Amino acid sequence: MDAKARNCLLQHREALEKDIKTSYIMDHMISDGFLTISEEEKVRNEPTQQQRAAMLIKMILKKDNDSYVSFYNALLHEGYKDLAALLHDGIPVVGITSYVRTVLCEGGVPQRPVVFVTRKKLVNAIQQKLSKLKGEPGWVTIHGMAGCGKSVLAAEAVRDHSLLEGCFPGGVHWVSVGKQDKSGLLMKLQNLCTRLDQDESFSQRLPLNIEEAKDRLRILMLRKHPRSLLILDDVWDSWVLKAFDSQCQILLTTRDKSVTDSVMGPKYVVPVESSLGKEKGLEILSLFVNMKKADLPEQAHSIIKECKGSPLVVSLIGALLRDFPNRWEYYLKQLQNKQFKRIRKSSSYDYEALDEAMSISVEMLREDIKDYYTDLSILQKDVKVPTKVLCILWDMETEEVEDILQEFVNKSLLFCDRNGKSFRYYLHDLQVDFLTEKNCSQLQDLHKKIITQFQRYHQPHTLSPDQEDCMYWYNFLAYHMASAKMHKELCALMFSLDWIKAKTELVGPAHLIHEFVEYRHILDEKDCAVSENFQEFLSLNGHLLGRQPFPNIVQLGLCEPETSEVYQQAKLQAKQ
Ligand SMILES: Nc1ncnc2c1ncn2[C@@H]1O[C@H](COP(=O)(O)OP(=O)(O)O)[C@@H](O)[C@H]1O
C-alpha cells in the first residue's frame, strides 16, 4: 500500500485494536474479496477481542490499497465513525458512498439482511414519494403485511447518496416502534430524545411523559435536526403517530394504512405486495447457496411455492440449504409435511410456513447451542437487547456470547444492529410468536433464570447509567420477575423507597406507576394492598418525581397515611 496509508494505519493501530469487534468487519471484507476464509479463521482463534483486532490489522498491513479502503468501508458500515476518521487521513486511491454509510449508521438504520435482493420498483416508488416532501413536513407510509419486507425497504430507500444529500442533508434517524402502550411509547421516545441530543445542548433530564417528549422532539428536530428524515418502523396506532406530529418529515411502516387518520399534512402511500415473487424468492435461495438461479435444483421452485412469498421464510430455508447442501428433497418434504402445532391458531398472519421453517431450522442447530436459542424465548417484541444482558443470562464472556449469537444471526434466526462496538440483538415479531408458542411451558423458568443470573452480577441499588445494560434492567427487571411469577422478589424490588428514588430520578414515575398496576395480579391479598399504597404515593407525587431539584422521598413518604407501608419505610429511614 501507499506510505501515507501504512503510516496512517500504523499510527492508529492501538486505537483500532482497543475498540473494534472483528466479526462483522471481516464479513464485509470477505464480501469485497480482500480477505480470505482461513485469514478469518486465524483471527477468530485469537483468545480475545483485542487480539482478534491485532491479528486482523497485522494481516491488513501486508495488503494492497483496496483492502485499506474495504476495511475503511467496513468501519463506516459497522459504525466506527471516529476510527475511520483517523484512517481517512491516509486513504489511498482504489449509489452507496462513505457519506451514505456514515449517515445511516449515525441514524441507527439497520444494516442490510445477511442475504439481500433488490426490489427496485418498490424502492424507487418510496424514493419518489420522499422526494415530494421538498423540505416541508409530511408523511410517507409503507404499508403491507407482517414480514413482507417493509423495514428492509425503508432502509434501502435512504441508502442512496443523491436522495440523502438532496432531500435530507440533516440526516435520518430510525425509530423501532412496534405495538406500544403509553409507557412503552414513552420508553421509546426517551431513548430517541437521548439519541437526538448527544452533545447535550438541550436538557440533561429525560422527558417524563408523552406530552413533554412530543414537545422535546419538536425542539430537537427544529434546532438540531432540521431538513432530516425520521423513520418509524411498525406503527400500530394513530395515537402513536400524533406523538410524532411536530412539523417533521416522516417515513413510517405499518400493517394498517389507517394509522395516519389523526394526523394532517401531505400524505403519500406505498403499498407493498403481500408476497415476494417467485423469481426474487429463487434469487434469495441462489445467493444463500452460492449458485446461479438457472443452476438451482428442481426442488427450489417447489420450496418457493411452500414459502408462500414470505422473505423471512425463504431466508430461513435458504440458510438451511446453505448449511446442509445436498438435502433439497429432504427439506422440501419437511415443508410439505407440516408437523408443528399452533395453539394460538389464527392471527393477522398465516404462520404455517414460518412455523415450520423455524421448527426445522431450530431442529438443525448443533446440540450445544439449542438451549441457548431456547433461552431467547424471553426476548420481547420490539426490544433490542445489548450483549451484556446475554452475558449475564449465560454467565459467559462477551466474545463467546457474540460468537454464539452470530451463528443464529447467520441462520436468520436472530438479528443484530451494530453501531461500532455496541451490539444489540432482536427477533422479528413473527419469531417471538414462534418461540412463545414452541416453548410456552418453559417460559416461566426462563424468566426466573434471568432474574437468578441478574442477582449474581448486580443489585438493584448497584445499577448506573454508564453501564450498557442499565436501562434494560430499569425497564424490564420487574417485567421478568412478574413473568417468572417471583412475587417475593418483585415485592422486595418495588416496595422500596430506594428503588423509587433511583428509578424516578432517571425516567420519572410513569412506567413505575404502570408496573404497579400491570403486575398486581400475581400478588397475594396482603402484597396487593401494599402495592396500592405505593401506587397512590407515586400518583399523588407524580408531578414532583424525576424533576430537578429532586424531591426528598423520605419527607414525601412521611406525608403518607401512618397505615401505609410507604410511611413506615419513610419513618425508618428518617430515624436511621
Ligand atoms: N430485499 C430483501 N432481500 C432479502 N431478504 C429480505 C428482503 N426484504 C426482507 N427480507 C427478509 O425478511 C425479513 C423480514 O423483513 P422486514 O423488512 O423485517 O419485514 P416487515 O418489516 O415487513 O415485517 C428480514 O429479516 C429478512 O430476513
From Swiss-Prot:
Tissue expression remark = Ubiquitous. Highest levels of expression in adult spleen and peripheral blood leukocytes, and in fetal brain, kidney and lung. Isoform 1 is expressed in heart, kidney and liver.
Q: Kindly list the places in or outside the cell where this protein is found, as annotated in its UniProt entry.
A: Cytoplasm
Stimuli inducing this protein: By E2F and p53/TP53 in apoptotic neurons. Translation is inhibited by HNRPA1, which binds to the IRES of APAF1 mRNAs.
Q: Disulfide connectivity?
A: none
Substituting residue 358 to L results in:
Activation of pro-caspase-9 independent of cytochrome c. Increased ability to induce apoptosis
Domain CARD, by residue range, is 1-90
Location of the NB-ARC domain: 95-405
Q: Which residues bind ATP?
A: 144-151, 255
Task: Give the function comment from the record.
Answer: Oligomeric Apaf-1 mediates the cytochrome c-dependent autocatalytic activation of pro-caspase-9 (Apaf-3), leading to the activation of caspase-3 and apoptosis. This activation requires ATP. Isoform 6 is less effective in inducing apoptosis.
Subunit structure comment from the entry? Monomer. Oligomerizes to a heptameric ring, known as the apoptosome, upon binding of cytochrome c and dATP. Oligomeric Apaf-1 and pro-caspase-9 bind to each other via their respective NH2-terminal CARD domains and consecutively mature caspase-9 is released from the complex. Pro-caspase-3 is recruited into the Apaf-1-pro-caspase-9 complex via interaction with pro-caspase-9. Interacts with APIP. Interacts (via CARD and NACHT domains) with NAIP/BIRC1 (via NACHT domain). Interacts with CIAO2A.
Record's miscellaneous remark? Physiological concentrations of calcium ions negatively affect the assembly of apoptosome by inhibiting nucleotide exchange in the monomeric form.
Please quote what the entry notes about the protein's domains.
The CARD domain mediates interaction with APIP. The monomeric form is autoinhibited in a closed conformation through a bound ADP at the nucleotide binding site. Exchange of ADP for ATP and binding of cytochrome c trigger a large conformational change where the first WD repeat region swings out, allowing the NB-ARC domain to rotate and expose the contact areas for oligomerization.
Q: What is the protein's given name?
A: Apoptotic protease-activating factor 1
Query: What is the scientific name of the source organism?
Result: Homo sapiens (Human)
Placed within the complete protein, the shown segment runs: 1 to 586 of 1248
